[PDB]
Amino acid sequence: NPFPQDFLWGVATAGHQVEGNNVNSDVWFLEHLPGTIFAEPSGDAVDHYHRYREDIALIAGLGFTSYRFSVEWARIEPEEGHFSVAALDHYKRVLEACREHGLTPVVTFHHFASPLWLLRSGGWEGERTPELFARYCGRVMAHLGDLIGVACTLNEPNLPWLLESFGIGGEAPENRGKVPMWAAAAQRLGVDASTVAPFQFCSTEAGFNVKLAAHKAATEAIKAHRPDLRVGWTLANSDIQSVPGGEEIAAQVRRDVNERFLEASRGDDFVGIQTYGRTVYGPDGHAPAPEGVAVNQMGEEIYPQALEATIREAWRVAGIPVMVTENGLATEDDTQRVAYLRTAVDGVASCLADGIDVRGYIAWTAFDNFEWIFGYGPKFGLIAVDRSTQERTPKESARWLGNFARQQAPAEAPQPA
Amino acid sequence: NPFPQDFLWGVATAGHQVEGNNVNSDVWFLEHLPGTIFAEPSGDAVDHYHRYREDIALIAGLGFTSYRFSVEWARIEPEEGHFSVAALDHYKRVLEACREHGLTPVVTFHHFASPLWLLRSGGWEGERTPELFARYCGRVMAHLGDLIGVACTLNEPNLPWLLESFGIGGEAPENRGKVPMWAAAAQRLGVDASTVAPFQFCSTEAGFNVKLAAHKAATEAIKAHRPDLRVGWTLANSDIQSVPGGEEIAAQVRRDVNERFLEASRGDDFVGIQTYGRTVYGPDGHAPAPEGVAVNQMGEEIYPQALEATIREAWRVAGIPVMVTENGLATEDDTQRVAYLRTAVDGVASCLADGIDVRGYIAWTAFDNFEWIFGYGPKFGLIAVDRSTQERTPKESARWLGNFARQ
């Protein structure tokens, strides 16, 4: 068996995507702006904020051994310097639920959404962000740090560098004013549009430095409470490929998005790898590539072979233990998700059988949810939710993966201790 | 007793003062503005949002038969036209807890705090405000109306008029810009200050018409779900008195603040009376306490005889049943509170005994809480909360009044 007994089998969520009523967040604010690129508001999402106990019990019943979720800074520090012990107690009860159900909690301290007030100090390019984040992380540790299994500081700091290569984003700061969304944003924040920089859109050297310092200062804050607790960030590392004409563009992208962040990870306990497919570049940049085999729901290629390739890359470049903190598939046909997961798990086993220190596998996502700018259309969940009633119904993929996890545990009788 | 069989004995709260994290409300926003008049932010308050079950068990264990609390528009409709079913289920659970503990729930549909977005459309001077408020009251009824024991549409529409008589607000709208907090509110909302009108500061003719229209449209929305449910609004009615020199001033205030609103109440099923003390006017306007006892934490005269007066007044002007939806005392010494509640309650019984139809007594307030611009200084609670730990400790007044109910 290539998986060790302590290997984590989980599903992941992000607070804004499942909790509902993240009304103090930047993303919420962006969802309701006149010029918005968000297709619909998050609203209640799946109401994980109130239903987490039953959600945890469901997940643990399916045989998962871990649960990854975010603590939301927008709730914890709702205005700069005014921490909410009430919200911190909410997340302590979440962690207590995990622990009562045997789940190791993988806590993401930040998952794109920020308190809206942060966007007035320059957001993820502001020089105070690294220390405010770190202060924030110390406060969460102060209140519930003993209950965390594993810590992820930041989710996908490199995402917008990859989106820029499409590229959706990455206007120059001096040009953010010309996209409606940013112009509006700045106006109501009472601030200049060149200074508007939520986490997931910022691909600027300022933003690189701010992200890295925030990671660094947060790790230290966290270690001050639990020196034993393993910490890393997570990366949006695709399997980068090319066709003829795209070799140099592919190389540039692999370098700026993947290797640069993995180089920056080399001090850490682990790195989180988040991978869905390959990303192919030709002479005109991004090519949704040649066709076969997705047909994902978004019309992207179904290529869970990517995971094994990014795990290998991460081991090579960073040389630290890897945890797969996201992996999954957007599809309305769950039989495709099952076949995808079989292959991705094979990818993991294959890396482990080669001596790569992989420490868990966490599927994106637990429940069909708010897929950022595309809203509720894209279905990534291993568990269905009828949002109108909030009823949860596990899909076969949840039973398959859950039961795979369960079937890796030893089976010995009790032994005098 | 002269208390009928089904007289309600309650304690009351307001969602902004007790729940914590009312981050989408207009008040929250005003608490954090640069030139704010709020002495401190509400923050977590006493975290009633999370602890309500324990709070209601405690309330019920003490002997009360009723609980008055708000549902917060700021959480139910966080953006105009976007209702939260999860916020509605929360409140649904609050009502289920009440009933599980045998407590008749008295729900206030609005208790000063509004969604921040409402302030961008002219707030409680906004001409769409009545129909928005009614629509909101409808959604709440659709989700949970069957669990409400009594309904209070609006809390103290008339408060800011009373305060104006102390020269404490009531700038004409053209001069709102001159108050720092309004100028800051304006700038952050992208709106002119003349337009900024949160409920409890708005004592303008427009705000009278808007409040009244909202109360009426809300009443009609709630009866479309529950024609049996008793509906009214609550009034900030002091026992307005004079000394020689103050007669015209006193009559004026009595007419604009109490009688005008009681007249406006004449169609309703009951009027909620909220009274704490007397307000005395002399030749120089509002008079300070005499070399006359106690006094309360705010230096106002401790005057429980006020309640009997405002009940008699309401019966006379409105002519409909009276519910005491707030009465109590701000004080650090609870022995003063016990004595106050005893006499107030005697005042109520004396009204009852004269045939005035009083339907309930509800004390302000369950828990020491966020007293608006005064922050956590003032202690009105029958139950103490050490906010650092959120630990609840019933004062003697809790056990006194609870036990009084229990007979």
GROMACS .gro file of C-alpha atoms in nm, chain B residues 48-393:
model
  346
  465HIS     CA    1  -2.727   3.686   2.144
  466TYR     CA    2  -2.717   3.577   1.776
  467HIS     CA    3  -2.524   3.268   1.884
  468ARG     CA    4  -2.643   3.217   2.242
  469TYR     CA    5  -3.014   3.270   2.197
  470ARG     CA    6  -3.111   2.921   2.305
  471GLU     CA    7  -2.937   2.948   2.637
  472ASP     CA    8  -3.070   3.304   2.674
  473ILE     CA    9  -3.432   3.191   2.622
  474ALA     CA   10  -3.397   2.887   2.856
  475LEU     CA   11  -3.263   3.129   3.125
  476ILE     CA   12  -3.546   3.383   3.060
  477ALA     CA   13  -3.803   3.105   3.085
  478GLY     CA   14  -3.637   2.942   3.389
  479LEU     CA   15  -3.669   3.272   3.576
  480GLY     CA   16  -4.043   3.265   3.526
  481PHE     CA   17  -4.117   3.500   3.239
  482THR     CA   18  -4.395   3.400   2.995
  483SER     CA   19  -4.299   3.614   2.701
  484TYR     CA   20  -3.992   3.743   2.512
  485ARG     CA   21  -3.972   4.057   2.299
  486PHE     CA   22  -3.695   4.084   2.045
  487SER     CA   23  -3.632   4.220   1.696
  488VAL     CA   24  -3.583   4.068   1.357
  489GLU     CA   25  -3.316   4.269   1.177
  490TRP     CA   26  -3.391   4.391   0.827
  491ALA     CA   27  -3.015   4.440   0.780
  492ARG     CA   28  -2.966   4.057   0.797
  493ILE     CA   29  -3.297   3.955   0.621
  494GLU     CA   30  -3.251   4.179   0.312
  495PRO     CA   31  -2.876   4.246   0.291
  496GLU     CA   32  -2.905   4.413  -0.052
  497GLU     CA   33  -3.223   4.565  -0.181
  498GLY     CA   34  -3.428   4.289  -0.339
  499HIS     CA   35  -3.200   4.005  -0.222
  500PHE     CA   36  -3.358   3.823   0.073
  501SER     CA   37  -3.162   3.579   0.291
  502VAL     CA   38  -3.356   3.259   0.364
  503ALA     CA   39  -3.064   3.161   0.597
  504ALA     CA   40  -3.119   3.473   0.807
  505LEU     CA   41  -3.492   3.396   0.809
  506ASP     CA   42  -3.422   3.035   0.933
  507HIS     CA   43  -3.208   3.175   1.207
  508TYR     CA   44  -3.498   3.376   1.333
  509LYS     CA   45  -3.729   3.087   1.276
  510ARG     CA   46  -3.507   2.894   1.522
  511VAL     CA   47  -3.524   3.177   1.770
  512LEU     CA   48  -3.904   3.154   1.767
  513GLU     CA   49  -3.895   2.773   1.790
  514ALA     CA   50  -3.673   2.805   2.095
  515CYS     CA   51  -3.927   3.053   2.254
  516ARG     CA   52  -4.216   2.814   2.200
  517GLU     CA   53  -4.017   2.513   2.316
  518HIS     CA   54  -3.968   2.705   2.642
  519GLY     CA   55  -4.330   2.818   2.667
  520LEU     CA   56  -4.258   3.189   2.588
  521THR     CA   57  -4.499   3.393   2.383
  522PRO     CA   58  -4.281   3.565   2.128
  523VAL     CA   59  -4.336   3.939   2.074
  524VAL     CA   60  -4.149   4.033   1.756
  525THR     CA   61  -4.043   4.387   1.666
  526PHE     CA   62  -4.000   4.396   1.283
  527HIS     CA   63  -3.781   4.706   1.305
  528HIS     CA   64  -3.604   4.844   1.609
  529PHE     CA   65  -3.408   5.144   1.480
  530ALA     CA   66  -3.147   4.956   1.279
  531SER     CA   67  -3.204   4.940   0.902
  532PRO     CA   68  -2.996   4.792   0.618
  533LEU     CA   69  -2.717   5.033   0.523
  534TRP     CA   70  -2.844   5.035   0.159
  535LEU     CA   71  -3.173   5.187   0.277
  536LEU     CA   72  -2.984   5.500   0.381
  537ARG     CA   73  -2.867   5.553   0.016
  538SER     CA   74  -3.230   5.588  -0.094
  539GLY     CA   75  -3.317   5.859   0.163
  540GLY     CA   76  -3.382   5.620   0.455
  541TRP     CA   77  -3.686   5.705   0.667
  542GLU     CA   78  -3.764   5.997   0.448
  543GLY     CA   79  -3.747   5.779   0.136
  544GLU     CA   80  -4.072   5.760  -0.049
  545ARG     CA   81  -4.020   5.389  -0.147
  546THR     CA   82  -3.944   5.304   0.221
  547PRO     CA   83  -4.305   5.217   0.317
  548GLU     CA   84  -4.347   4.961   0.034
  549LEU     CA   85  -3.994   4.816   0.091
  550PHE     CA   86  -4.066   4.781   0.462
  551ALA     CA   87  -4.398   4.614   0.392
  552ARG     CA   88  -4.239   4.377   0.141
  553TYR     CA   89  -3.974   4.285   0.402
  554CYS     CA   90  -4.244   4.227   0.668
  555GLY     CA   91  -4.420   3.998   0.416
  556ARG     CA   92  -4.107   3.784   0.360
  557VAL     CA   93  -4.064   3.738   0.727
  558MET     CA   94  -4.424   3.636   0.766
  559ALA     CA   95  -4.393   3.395   0.476
  560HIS     CA   96  -4.103   3.227   0.649
  561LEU     CA   97  -4.210   3.230   1.009
  562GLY     CA   98  -4.532   3.420   1.068
  563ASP     CA   99  -4.711   3.122   1.222
  564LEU     CA  100  -4.471   3.122   1.521
  565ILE     CA  101  -4.519   3.492   1.619
  566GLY     CA  102  -4.735   3.553   1.929
  567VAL     CA  103  -4.769   3.936   1.890
  568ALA     CA  104  -4.628   4.178   1.633
  569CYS     CA  105  -4.471   4.521   1.681
  570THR     CA  106  -4.414   4.689   1.343
  571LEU     CA  107  -4.200   4.984   1.441
  572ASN     CA  108  -4.009   5.077   1.763
  573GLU     CA  109  -4.044   5.437   1.882
  574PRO     CA  110  -4.109   5.634   1.568
  575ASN     CA  111  -4.159   5.932   1.791
  576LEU     CA  112  -3.830   5.917   1.990
  577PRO     CA  113  -3.640   6.174   1.789
  578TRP     CA  114  -3.919   6.431   1.836
  579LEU     CA  115  -3.883   6.389   2.217
  580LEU     CA  116  -3.507   6.434   2.184
  581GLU     CA  117  -3.554   6.742   1.969
  582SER     CA  118  -3.738   6.902   2.263
  583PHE     CA  119  -3.410   6.869   2.454
  584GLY     CA  120  -3.234   7.031   2.151
  585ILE     CA  121  -3.064   6.695   2.075
  586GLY     CA  122  -3.122   6.650   1.705
  587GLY     CA  123  -3.380   6.770   1.459
  588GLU     CA  124  -3.158   6.995   1.239
  589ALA     CA  125  -3.353   7.082   0.927
  590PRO     CA  126  -3.250   6.855   0.644
  591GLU     CA  127  -3.056   7.144   0.476
  592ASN     CA  128  -2.836   7.160   0.781
  593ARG     CA  129  -2.756   6.794   0.827
  594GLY     CA  130  -2.433   6.859   0.645
  595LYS     CA  131  -2.326   7.075   0.942
  596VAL     CA  132  -2.314   6.776   1.176
  597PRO     CA  133  -1.984   6.594   1.136
  598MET     CA  134  -2.129   6.244   1.156
  599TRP     CA  135  -2.382   6.318   0.879
  600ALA     CA  136  -2.113   6.484   0.661
  601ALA     CA  137  -1.899   6.173   0.699
  602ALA     CA  138  -2.195   5.943   0.640
  603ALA     CA  139  -2.283   6.140   0.325
  604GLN     CA  140  -1.929   6.135   0.181
  605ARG     CA  141  -1.893   5.761   0.227
  606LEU     CA  142  -2.232   5.687   0.073
  607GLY     CA  143  -2.185   5.923  -0.226
  608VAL     CA  144  -2.496   6.113  -0.121
  609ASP     CA  145  -2.590   6.463  -0.003
  610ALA     CA  146  -2.619   6.495   0.381
  611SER     CA  147  -2.962   6.651   0.359
  612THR     CA  148  -3.077   6.298   0.242
  613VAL     CA  149  -2.923   6.099   0.535
  614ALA     CA  150  -3.216   5.994   0.764
  615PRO     CA  151  -3.178   5.690   0.989
  616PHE     CA  152  -3.500   5.607   1.173
  617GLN     CA  153  -3.414   5.721   1.525
  618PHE     CA  154  -3.276   6.063   1.422
  619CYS     CA  155  -3.555   6.157   1.179
  620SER     CA  156  -3.813   6.396   1.332
  621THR     CA  157  -3.914   6.569   1.015
  622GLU     CA  158  -4.263   6.592   0.853
  623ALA     CA  159  -4.151   6.361   0.578
  624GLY     CA  160  -4.027   6.108   0.834
  625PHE     CA  161  -4.361   6.125   1.018
  626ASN     CA  162  -4.546   6.044   0.691
  627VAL     CA  163  -4.299   5.776   0.596
  628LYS     CA  164  -4.303   5.608   0.938
  629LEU     CA  165  -4.681   5.617   0.956
  630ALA     CA  166  -4.719   5.481   0.599
  631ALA     CA  167  -4.469   5.210   0.678
  632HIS     CA  168  -4.657   5.106   0.994
  633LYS     CA  169  -4.988   5.091   0.801
  634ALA     CA  170  -4.850   4.901   0.500
  635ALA     CA  171  -4.667   4.662   0.733
  636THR     CA  172  -4.982   4.600   0.935
  637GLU     CA  173  -5.168   4.513   0.613
  638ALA     CA  174  -4.878   4.277   0.500
  639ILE     CA  175  -4.879   4.096   0.835
  640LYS     CA  176  -5.257   4.056   0.844
  641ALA     CA  177  -5.248   3.905   0.491
  642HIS     CA  178  -5.064   3.617   0.655
  643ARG     CA  179  -5.218   3.620   1.005
  644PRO     CA  180  -5.543   3.817   1.035
  645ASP     CA  181  -5.568   3.686   1.397
  646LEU     CA  182  -5.227   3.823   1.494
  647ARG     CA  183  -5.240   4.133   1.706
  648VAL     CA  184  -5.039   4.418   1.555
  649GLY     CA  185  -4.928   4.758   1.675
  650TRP     CA  186  -4.635   4.993   1.705
  651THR     CA  187  -4.448   5.112   2.014
  652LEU     CA  188  -4.419   5.466   2.133
  653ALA     CA  189  -4.155   5.659   2.328
  654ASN     CA  190  -4.405   5.821   2.561
  655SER     CA  191  -4.271   5.997   2.866
  656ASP     CA  192  -4.494   6.143   3.139
  657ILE     CA  193  -4.464   6.498   3.026
  658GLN     CA  194  -4.507   6.750   3.309
  659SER     CA  195  -4.461   7.120   3.379
  660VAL     CA  196  -4.356   7.356   3.650
  661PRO     CA  197  -4.503   7.713   3.646
  662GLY     CA  198  -4.355   7.876   3.333
  663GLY     CA  199  -4.343   7.546   3.136
  664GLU     CA  200  -4.713   7.489   3.054
  665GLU     CA  201  -4.711   7.578   2.681
  666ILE     CA  202  -4.379   7.409   2.624
  667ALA     CA  203  -4.509   7.097   2.804
  668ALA     CA  204  -4.841   7.096   2.614
  669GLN     CA  205  -4.648   7.131   2.287
  670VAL     CA  206  -4.424   6.838   2.352
  671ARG     CA  207  -4.723   6.635   2.482
  672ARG     CA  208  -4.909   6.706   2.155
  673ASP     CA  209  -4.625   6.654   1.898
  674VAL     CA  210  -4.460   6.354   2.064
  675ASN     CA  211  -4.731   6.156   2.251
  676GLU     CA  212  -5.082   6.256   2.138
  677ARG     CA  213  -5.014   6.290   1.762
  678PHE     CA  214  -4.872   5.936   1.763
  679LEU     CA  215  -5.147   5.793   1.989
  680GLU     CA  216  -5.403   5.949   1.748
  681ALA     CA  217  -5.227   5.785   1.459
  682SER     CA  218  -5.261   5.457   1.646
  683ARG     CA  219  -5.637   5.457   1.665
  684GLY     CA  220  -5.698   5.183   1.418
  685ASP     CA  221  -5.455   4.930   1.564
  686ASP     CA  222  -5.508   4.620   1.781
  687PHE     CA  223  -5.293   4.759   2.064
  688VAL     CA  224  -5.029   5.031   2.116
  689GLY     CA  225  -4.701   4.939   2.285
  690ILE     CA  226  -4.616   5.194   2.556
  691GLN     CA  227  -4.247   5.251   2.645
  692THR     CA  228  -4.190   5.472   2.942
  693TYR     CA  229  -3.908   5.528   3.193
  694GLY     CA  230  -3.966   5.860   3.374
  695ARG     CA  231  -4.112   6.205   3.361
  696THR     CA  232  -3.981   6.483   3.147
  697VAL     CA  233  -4.036   6.815   3.318
  698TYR     CA  234  -4.043   7.151   3.133
  699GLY     CA  235  -4.000   7.490   3.306
  700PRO     CA  236  -3.981   7.846   3.168
  701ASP     CA  237  -3.631   7.769   3.029
  702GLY     CA  238  -3.738   7.444   2.854
  703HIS     CA  239  -3.626   7.103   2.979
  704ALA     CA  240  -3.571   7.091   3.355
  705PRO     CA  241  -3.297   6.902   3.542
  706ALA     CA  242  -3.380   6.667   3.830
  707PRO     CA  243  -3.487   6.846   4.153
  708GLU     CA  244  -3.312   6.808   4.494
  709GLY     CA  245  -3.538   6.502   4.457
  710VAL     CA  246  -3.384   6.162   4.523
  711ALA     CA  247  -3.218   5.895   4.357
  712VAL     CA  248  -3.114   5.955   4.076
  713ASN     CA  249  -3.064   5.721   3.773
  714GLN     CA  250  -2.729   5.638   3.611
  715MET     CA  251  -2.796   5.922   3.355
  716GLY     CA  252  -2.885   6.171   3.635
  717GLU     CA  253  -3.256   6.158   3.541
  718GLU     CA  254  -3.509   6.140   3.822
  719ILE     CA  255  -3.610   5.783   3.927
  720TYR     CA  256  -3.982   5.808   3.864
  721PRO     CA  257  -4.168   5.480   3.818
  722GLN     CA  258  -4.507   5.665   3.857
  723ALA     CA  259  -4.446   5.769   3.495
  724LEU     CA  260  -4.578   5.436   3.364
  725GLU     CA  261  -4.923   5.467   3.523
  726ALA     CA  262  -4.950   5.813   3.367
  727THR     CA  263  -4.855   5.710   3.012
  728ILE     CA  264  -5.090   5.408   3.025
  729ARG     CA  265  -5.381   5.633   3.131
  730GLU     CA  266  -5.283   5.882   2.861
  731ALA     CA  267  -5.278   5.616   2.588
  732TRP     CA  268  -5.613   5.472   2.691
  733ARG     CA  269  -5.754   5.824   2.676
  734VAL     CA  270  -5.605   5.932   2.338
  735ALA     CA  271  -5.571   5.603   2.142
  736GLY     CA  272  -5.863   5.423   2.310
  737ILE     CA  273  -5.726   5.076   2.236
  738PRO     CA  274  -5.558   4.807   2.445
  739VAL     CA  275  -5.218   4.894   2.596
  740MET     CA  276  -4.912   4.669   2.609
  741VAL     CA  277  -4.617   4.786   2.818
  742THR     CA  278  -4.345   4.690   2.567
  743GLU     CA  279  -4.066   4.865   2.761
  744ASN     CA  280  -4.015   4.978   3.118
  745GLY     CA  281  -3.703   4.980   3.341
  746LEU     CA  282  -3.415   5.167   3.499
  747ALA     CA  283  -3.057   5.246   3.415
  748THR     CA  284  -2.858   5.184   3.733
  749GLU     CA  285  -2.551   5.017   3.881
  750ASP     CA  286  -2.745   4.937   4.203
  751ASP     CA  287  -3.009   4.668   4.131
  752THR     CA  288  -3.182   4.727   4.464
  753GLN     CA  289  -3.299   5.053   4.306
  754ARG     CA  290  -3.422   4.856   4.006
  755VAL     CA  291  -3.630   4.613   4.219
  756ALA     CA  292  -3.804   4.898   4.398
  757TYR     CA  293  -3.865   5.076   4.064
  758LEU     CA  294  -4.017   4.764   3.900
  759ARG     CA  295  -4.232   4.702   4.205
  760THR     CA  296  -4.390   5.048   4.190
  761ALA     CA  297  -4.416   5.044   3.808
  762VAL     CA  298  -4.593   4.712   3.822
  763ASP     CA  299  -4.827   4.849   4.097
  764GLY     CA  300  -4.895   5.135   3.854
  765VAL     CA  301  -5.000   4.877   3.592
  766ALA     CA  302  -5.224   4.689   3.832
  767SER     CA  303  -5.386   5.015   3.941
  768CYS     CA  304  -5.470   5.078   3.568
  769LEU     CA  305  -5.604   4.726   3.529
  770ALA     CA  306  -5.819   4.768   3.832
  771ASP     CA  307  -5.984   5.077   3.679
  772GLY     CA  308  -6.087   4.877   3.366
  773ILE     CA  309  -5.803   4.991   3.137
  774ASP     CA  310  -5.720   4.699   2.907
  775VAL     CA  311  -5.351   4.637   2.956
  776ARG     CA  312  -5.224   4.320   2.788
  777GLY     CA  313  -4.870   4.279   2.906
  778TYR     CA  314  -4.569   4.411   3.098
  779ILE     CA  315  -4.230   4.377   2.927
  780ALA     CA  316  -3.922   4.510   3.109
  781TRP     CA  317  -3.628   4.680   2.934
  782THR     CA  318  -3.396   4.495   2.913
  783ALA     CA  319  -3.302   4.127   2.943
  784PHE     CA  320  -2.929   4.184   2.932
  785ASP     CA  321  -2.697   4.476   3.001
  786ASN     CA  322  -2.634   4.577   2.644
  787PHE     CA  323  -2.523   4.836   2.392
  788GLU     CA  324  -2.717   5.149   2.483
  789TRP     CA  325  -2.676   5.320   2.138
  790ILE     CA  326  -2.459   5.638   2.149
  791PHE     CA  327  -2.377   5.579   2.516
  792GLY     CA  328  -2.218   5.240   2.445
  793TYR     CA  329  -2.195   4.985   2.733
  794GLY     CA  330  -2.192   5.242   3.020
  795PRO     CA  331  -2.567   5.244   3.095
  796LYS     CA  332  -2.696   4.934   3.275
  797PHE     CA  333  -3.059   4.864   3.200
  798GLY     CA  334  -3.046   4.476   3.214
  799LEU     CA  335  -3.222   4.252   3.463
  800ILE     CA  336  -2.938   4.009   3.382
  801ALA     CA  337  -2.564   4.103   3.384
  802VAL     CA  338  -2.326   3.992   3.099
  803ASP     CA  339  -1.958   4.002   3.146
  804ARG     CA  340  -1.884   4.073   2.788
  805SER     CA  341  -1.526   3.951   2.803
  806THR     CA  342  -1.656   3.591   2.866
  807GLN     CA  343  -2.024   3.641   2.758
  808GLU     CA  344  -2.121   3.484   3.096
  809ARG     CA  345  -2.480   3.570   3.199
  810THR     CA  346  -2.560   3.654   3.567
   0.00000   0.00000   0.00000
